[PDB]
Design a protein around this ligand. Structure first.
Ligand code: HEM
Ligand code: HEM
Ligand SMILES: CCCCCCCN1CCC[C@H]1C(=O)N[C@@H](Cc1ccccc1)C(=O)O
Ligand SMILES: CCCCCCCN1CCC[C@H]1C(=O)N[C@@H](Cc1ccccc1)C(=O)O
Ligand SMILES: C=Cc1ccccc1
Ligand SMILES: C=Cc1ccccc1
Lengths: 455, 455
């Protein structure tokens, strides 16, 4: 029963490419999935992929014996500054497994215990900023979540203080990074990228790349000249040895990994925290339950590692926010051999797939009628959730290496936010999702009322 | 008997006015005093004044039966936004004595004790900022001292948080205030203030005035809507009764007092702290003595009121810094009746005098030959200082109402800085004194090496 899959509207020789000519391409692709269903073909000059939206098909795509990670066009563009770091390397490149082996211990339990104190440092800075607001001033949520998450990966990972809460404007790094990611998103729809109309884009792209690399140099210079014995992500990067090849990372790859972890280690966690707070103020009953947990668990002025591990309802709040709005909204795969998807769609070796995560997470056959509802209780029993229904961290050996880092940081920070403040959606904010490859609310503001609980 | 005053060089019908056509007019008058001596006449079209530099003549000018406070042209210009607040009112205006009676209690010892905790709040924010700098970053001294001092008067005086340490740029109030003070100083030398060349200056001046008043609006509304009860400077402004008239201040005068205290309550203290640190890093023997005291007295993570009172040598450092560079560097007087100054200079009722405080403080007949040297030991025994020899806070009933506030804040903060850091003049900074009517080092930077003492 070989089916022919739908395809959205075409534009002559540009095929489907102009459908990406929007500032919200992921949301546009979601609307297409709404209309075409669980699978549709998407073509551009010289390229074809297939967008998957159903758990029925995505569970087969997650078979690592059949499909391996593919670099989407977006990741190929980001590779211009992230190189063969963990996020933008092919599984078969030597530096993928080597860096994976070397950096996996930087996310062990004992590693997370070692990061905890510095995570608290930044979280306390966030709480103090908010305690110090005047009456009827408000919080710019994504902006402050980005301050927090960038500073956390800088300090925990590299012993470097971006000091984001000492800045009313974003750190230079953030400004360049957002611009580079803007350029990568926008370059996706360009039919003729070498047209001189984009000479300035190219110049600015390089400019933003040197800005990011300059900071990387500074981080590296300080560490090697330092006199403080550190044991963090940068330590493993400079000293760890791959058990297989016996080799450490070389300097070029280390630079790529730092860029990778500074970007990947904060941007999606700030999106997650922003969406979580959004859903909490829109669902006060859920906020209360989570606040009750926070008050009962966080009985000391400074949260401990053990206490964060007990914020289990906060944990399902974050998972439910990742279900509705997974902040890294897609990943790509290619067929390792000829194979047939779902018994209907044959693929040849090398054929590409796009996993459209926000649409997967809206599969009504999995989650039921109330799929648009924010109900953290959905996550009470992982054994009741079918395989590969929930993929906000990717799949298999190419899944998110920093998943536990993000969840620990976000659980800690949200727990402290709910311990220390009541929140008001004073503008009745209308959710507006900005796309920079990743997803984040734009213009989300709230008011906090202090519970006046000492730190 | 009757002597003729010297006068500096003239410019035809502009008389002496072009001598003020400089970005550093106080320093120019200072050099003129060095050439001409204890008194010189200064003429501009339509105006004459006499600049006094010796303690011999200044002690007579400080006789309140013979001379009263005059509004210099500088203060007349600043009155365009400070009105009949305490700094820019005539002694004979009803609102001077009324506001003085109402607000003096805000600066009593019991009020000082009540401001202390908030002063520590901002000081701790300063220390934490510097603790969090990375390897070989540096401190912009006048910029951070202005962050501290504005936030201190805002919090202590008005329970309002400017949150200047959350801004990498100057607070908008500071930008507009600096520009208005700049305009007021530059306006002093304009022979034709109505030349169209100044139309933009006037436009900008009005705009900076509005920025300043908008912030005043926020402070008043913040207080009026505040269900929390306070007992600070703004409380007395809004509720205190003058025992003489029995009246409280009216709304118009309240606005002028708030602008007056926001400016006069921080600008000159930022200058003092900046000059003090400058002299400390240029005089390591003195820095050592001051740091010894700070380390010995401030034995607790949170300094107490009593401990700040014990920082005697830190206090002498501050007074010696006020001796060399009094940051409000002049005040003006007029003759109440015909009188003879110093047995030699006849004055008519209404004749004006300018007290050049930096020159007073260099009178070798008072201080000895070493007047240019930074020697806090001069202040060891305060009864050794002759009357009217040391006047950084003005004179008599028109003296600085905030003297004790400024010295307590500055002693606390300088004490904490010396407790928590070693300082390095890593650029061998060359003193450059920016003039905005008030005086402050420009471009002064240092490196701080934490002593790693917990807060
Ligand atoms: C909620 C926050 C986060 C989300 C939703 C997220 C999501 C993902 C996803 C979906 C992938 C797979 C990408 C693909 O298949 O092309 C991935 C990979 C990765 N993530 Fe995360 N991530 C998060 C936080 C972090 C953090 C904090 C770090 C760093 C500490 C991190 C480091 C990485 C790295 C290095 C990879 C590449 C892993 C490999 O292939 O070896 N992520 N992430
Ligand atoms: C080291 C810092 C300071 C210096 C050097 C200083 C200096 C002076 C001087 C010289 C005068 C007399 C001006 C004249 O005769 O025209 C004065 C007046 C005044 N100062 Fe200060 N001052 C300082 C700090 C402060 C602070 C912190 C406040 C507010 C808390 C303040 C509030 C005032 C007020 C209100 C007046 C006018 C007093 C009146 O005439 O009733 N000053 N100051
Ligand atoms: C950085 C973490 C998130 C990355 C998610 C990237 C996911 N894209 C972010 C923007 C849209 C979405 C996507 O569908 N992209 C495709 C677009 C494409 C398909 C076919 C031909 C040409 C180009 C791609 O990049 O190949
Ligand atoms: C705000 C607290 C500090 C005030 C310091 C003021 C002190 N001036 C600050 C800059 C110079 C100095 C001063 O000598 N000014 C005179 C100028 C003047 C004199 C005679 C004729 C025309 C103009 C004045 O303003 O009258
Ligand atoms: C979100 C992850 C990421 C990783 C590398 C470059 C750009 C983005
Ligand atoms: C330095 C004190 C002051 C006071 C009012 C206006 C401008 C300056």
């Amino acid at each position: 029963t070989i089916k022919e899959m739908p395809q959205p509207k075409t534009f002559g020789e540009l095929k489907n490419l102009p459908l990406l000519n929007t500032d919200k391409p992921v949301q546009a692709l979601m609307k297409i999935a709404d209309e075409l269903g669980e699978i549709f073909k998407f073509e551009a000059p010289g390229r074809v992929t297939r967008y998957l939206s159903s758990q029925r098909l995505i569970k087969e795509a997650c078979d690592e014996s059949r499909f391996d990670k593919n670099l989407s066009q977006a990741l190929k563009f980001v590779r211009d500054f992230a190189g063969d770091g963990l996020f933008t390397s092919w599984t078969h490149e030597k530096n993928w497994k080597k860096a994976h082996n070397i950096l996996l211990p930087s996310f062990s339990q004992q590693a997370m215990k070692g990061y905890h104190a510095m995570m608290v440092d930044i979280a306390v800075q966030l709480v103090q900023k908010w305690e110090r607001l005047n009456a009827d001033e408000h919080i710019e949520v994504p902006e402050d979540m980005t301050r927090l998450t960038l500073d956390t990966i800088g300090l925990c990972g590299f012993n470097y203080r971006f000091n984001s809460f000492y800045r009313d404007q974003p750190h230079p790094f953030i400004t360049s990074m957002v611009r580079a990611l803007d350029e990568a998103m926008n370059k996706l729809q360009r039919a003729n990228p070498d047209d001189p109309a984009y000479d300035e884009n190219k110049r600015q792209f390089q400019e933003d790349i040197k800005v990011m690399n300059d900071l990387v140099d500074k981080i590296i210079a300080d560490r090697k000249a330092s006199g403080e014995q550190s044991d963090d992500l940068l330590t493993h990067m400079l000293n760890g040895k791959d058990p297989e090849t016996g080799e450490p990372l070389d300097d070029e790859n280390i630079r790529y990994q730092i860029i990778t972890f500074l970007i990947a280690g904060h941007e999606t966690t700030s999106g997650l925290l922003s969406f979580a707070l959004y859903f909490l103020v829109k669902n006060p009953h859920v906020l209360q339950k989570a606040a009750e947990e926070a008050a009962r668990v966080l009985v000391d002025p400074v949260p401990s590692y053990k206490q964060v591990k007990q914020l289990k309802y906060v944990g399902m709040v974050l998972n439910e926010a990742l279900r509705l709005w997974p902040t890294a909204p897609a990943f790509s795969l290619y067929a390792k051999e000829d194979t047939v998807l779902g018994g209907e769609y044959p693929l040849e070796k090398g054929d590409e797939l796009m996993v459209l995560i926000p649409q997967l997470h809206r599969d009504k056959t999995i989650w039921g009628d109330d799929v648009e509802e924010f109900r953290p209780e959905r996550f009470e029993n992982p054994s009741a959730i079918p395989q590969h229904a929930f993929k906000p961290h990717g799949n298999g050996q190419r899944a998110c290496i920093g998943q536990q880092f993000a969840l620990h940081e976000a659980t800690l920070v949200l727990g402290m936010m709910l311990k220390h403040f009541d929140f008001e959606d004073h503008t009745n904010y209308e959710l507006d999702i900005k796309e920079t490859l990743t997803l984040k609310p734009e213009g989300f503001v709230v008011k906090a009322k202090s519970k006046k609980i000492p730190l």
